[PDB]
Design a protein around this ligand. Sequence first.
Ligand code: HEM
Ligand SMILES: C[As](C)(=O)[O-]
Length: 446
Amino acid sequence: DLLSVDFATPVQGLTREGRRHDGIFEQCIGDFRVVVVDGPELIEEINNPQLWEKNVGPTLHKLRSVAGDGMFTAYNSEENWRKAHEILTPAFTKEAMSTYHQRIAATVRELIDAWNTRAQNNSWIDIPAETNRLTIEIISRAGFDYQFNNLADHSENPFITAVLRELQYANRRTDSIPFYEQFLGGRRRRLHAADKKFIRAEVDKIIDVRRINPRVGQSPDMLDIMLTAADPVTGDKLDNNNIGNQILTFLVAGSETSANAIAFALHFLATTPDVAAQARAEVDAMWPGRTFPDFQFDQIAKLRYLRLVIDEALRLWPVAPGYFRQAKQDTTIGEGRYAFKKNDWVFVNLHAAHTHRSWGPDAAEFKPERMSTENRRKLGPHIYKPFGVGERACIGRQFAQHEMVIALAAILHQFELEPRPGYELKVSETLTLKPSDLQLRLRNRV
Ligand code: HEM
Ligand SMILES: C[As](C)(=O)[O-]
């Protein structure tokens, strides 16, 4: 059996390629050949913490030009991963979320207010871009108490523009990288040098201004803990350069993932009417009336069905489509087949595993009730790890799940969603999975 696969979208191409194999195979996608694992029994062996661990994959290695040794792009051996991980964990717990809840909810209010004017003017809204401006402000204001953009305004901050140009310059493949960019001083290399200094200077200013602020009577946020808490083992705090890396990390690793997940959930809510009705009924019962909901921290986790909507969105389209693992020792997965020497790395294809046949014959359908604890217990071997696995799983899972529910609850409570007729779901692949050309229109529910 011969197959022609288009790897223009890499992860979507690997998933189609994986259906002619038995859960593991090889494939050349771009600058490398990768062992792709998309089988339920094989993946859970790869997710074993005693034998395997996180591998800084190719793209993650290329993001080190932007985020350096931040928690997302640092190697396991680098002392700055363990220090930061044991320092920032208390800043991402459920307890720490209640400290941010007010600022998160206030930032959602700012977006809803801006979307009121667009609903009044009967305007089509580019959903991924708007949701990406929101999650940026959510992380920056709740985490660092810093504001980059006003959501009612459409001028873009120079800092966030430089970070995006710096992300594009990092992913540049070795063939598109000129052999002598380090020497000619072209416009692109010079723009990167200027952008890098401008980004480092802005995060240093955020660090210096806070250092002058004693923050009397206020609970410490993410920036405060990085300037206050020392690592219990080594006794040292995160140095200035690493703190600037964590700020850049939380900005890029937290914004795009959460924004595209919200954009996917908005699409499926605007397309399947029964789900939109059941979710809109759950948020109407929690906050009666059409006044903006008085969000209190405990009410967010009580929205069971809206949580099932986000879970099904993260299953059908995991914005983080996969992760790279490496072998801590010489081991074998499966049944003794497939041997791996220490430091050999594979790719866990979550998009293929989440849509795998083990999720039932209706794995391609958006059905939130599937993600209940009882409905999933009736499945057996199946993978659902949208936030990774192990000690290097997503530190911001509780943060993302909190902001994704408040954002969706406010939108469903205040607006109704009109999809674009004739449009069909196309998913582009950047650092994350994103709905391309997704446009919705809103009317105030009155
Ligand atoms: C829908 C939302 C999100 C999804 C699906 C997601 C997904 C993931 C995944 C799959 C990983 C593991 C990467 C790997 O194994 O190579 C990860 C790690 C990480 N995430 Fe996210 N994430 C989300 C939101 C956030 C947010 C809001 C933050 C805020 C700070 C964040 C910060 C991080 C960090 C720092 C790591 C690295 C942790 C470590 O390696 O020690 N993420 N995330
Ligand atoms: C380079 As490593 C083994 O610390 O991911």
